[PDB]
Amino acid sequence: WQENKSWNAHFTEHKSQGVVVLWNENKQQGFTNNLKRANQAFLPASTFKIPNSLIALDLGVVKDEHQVFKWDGQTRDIATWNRDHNLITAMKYSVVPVYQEFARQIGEARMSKMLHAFDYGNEDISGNVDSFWLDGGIRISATEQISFLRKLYHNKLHVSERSQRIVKQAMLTEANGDYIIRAKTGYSTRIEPKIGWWVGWVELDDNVWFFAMNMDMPTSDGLGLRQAITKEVLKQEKIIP
């Protein structure tokens, strides 16, 4: 992991603090504005929807990306959560209660064994079965998210090829004639420090660039900056126009 402090310009500019980590798959070389924070492990929060999805599909808790998970009737503070969802929309709107129920169905023994198979962060599921990635013992760094995502990208995780392809579909965030981004956002707020994440990758015609970023996120006002700052860095490195 090579250090490039000049990306801090983009954080300073927006009165923010964080790290971006990039990984050039073809050259097998990684870059970050801050080596220490790149390796600092945090609660994954909604970024956990990646592994949680893989596990739920592999075990048949989720049958496919069209199966409907009916709203439980409880109205919650994000409006999009109060309605029926499938896997695609549950990821898009980051619908926690839908993933809490997958987690209960998975159960702590299958969950722990899967997270060891995935080498996922510290591999510790201490806490409630349905919230450990929000306020429990699990921790992962920006560099460990990249390691994990690379395996997903190559269908190398110990779940079916099919589960992996479905999750990569459900990760689709943006695409045009220049690139494809598959990614997941997250916002850790239950346990200090409040931080925002975006992890995933950019597919080009002849390379892929993995990314993982996190940043201080005192309130939800600055969440747009997860993507905006990442993209500023991608632009600076000529990955996207």
Nearest Cα residue to 3 out of 18, 17, 22? 22
Pick what 192 binds: Cl ion, Co ion, its own copies, none; C-beta below 5 to 8 Å, kind-dependent: none
Residues carrying an active site annotation? 46
Indicate whether 162 belongs to the interface with Cl ion (CB under 5 A).
Answer: no
**Chain centroid offset of residue 11 CA:** 20
Binding mask 73-102 for ligand 5VW (x = CB under 6 A): ----xx---------------x-x------
Indicate whether 92 belongs to the interface with its own copies (CB under 8 A).
Answer: yes
If the CB atoms of residues 126 and 131 are measured against Co ion, the closer one turns out to be 126
Pick what 187 binds: its own copies, ligand 5VW, Co ion, none; C-beta below 5 to 8 Å, kind-dependent: ligand 5VW
Indicate whether 78 belongs to the interface with its own copies (CB under 8 A).
Answer: no
Label the pairing between strands 195-203 and 208-216. Answer: antiparallel
Selected from 28, 206, 219, 241, the binder of its own copies by CB under 8 A is: 206
Cα 90 from Cα 82, distance rounded (Å):
11
* CA–CA–CA angle 165, 200, 226 (5° rounding): 145
Rounded least distance, CB 43 to ligand 5VW, Å: 9
Indicate whether 45 belongs to the interface with ligand 5VW (CB under 6 A).
Answer: yes
Q: How many residues bind Cl ion (CB under 5 A)?
A: 2
Selected from 169, 190, 191, 224, the binder of Cl ion by CB under 5 A is: 169
Residue 186 in tokens: 């997250």
Nearest Cα residue to 210 out of 152, 123, 140, 139? 152
Cα 161 from Cα 186, distance rounded (Å):
25
Selected from 32, 34, 163, 185, the binder of ligand 5VW by CB under 6 A is: 185
Task: Put residue 196 in one of left, alpha, beta given phi > 0 → left and psi -120 to 50 → alpha.
Answer: beta
Q: Tell me the β-bridge partners of 196.
A: 187, 215
Indicate whether 144 belongs to the interface with Co ion (CB under 5 A).
Answer: no
Question: Has 150 been labeled as part of a binding site?
Answer: no
Indicate whether 104 belongs to the interface with its own copies (CB under 8 A).
Answer: no
Q: Tell me the β-bridge partners of 213.
A: 20, 198
Is the Cβ–Cβ distance between 69 and 174 less than 8 Å? Answer: no
Q: Would you list which residues are annotated within the binding site for a beta-lactam?
A: 46, 49, 94, 226
| Contacts with ligand 5VW, residue ranges (CB under 6 A) | 45-46, 77-78, 94, 96, 134, 185-187, 189
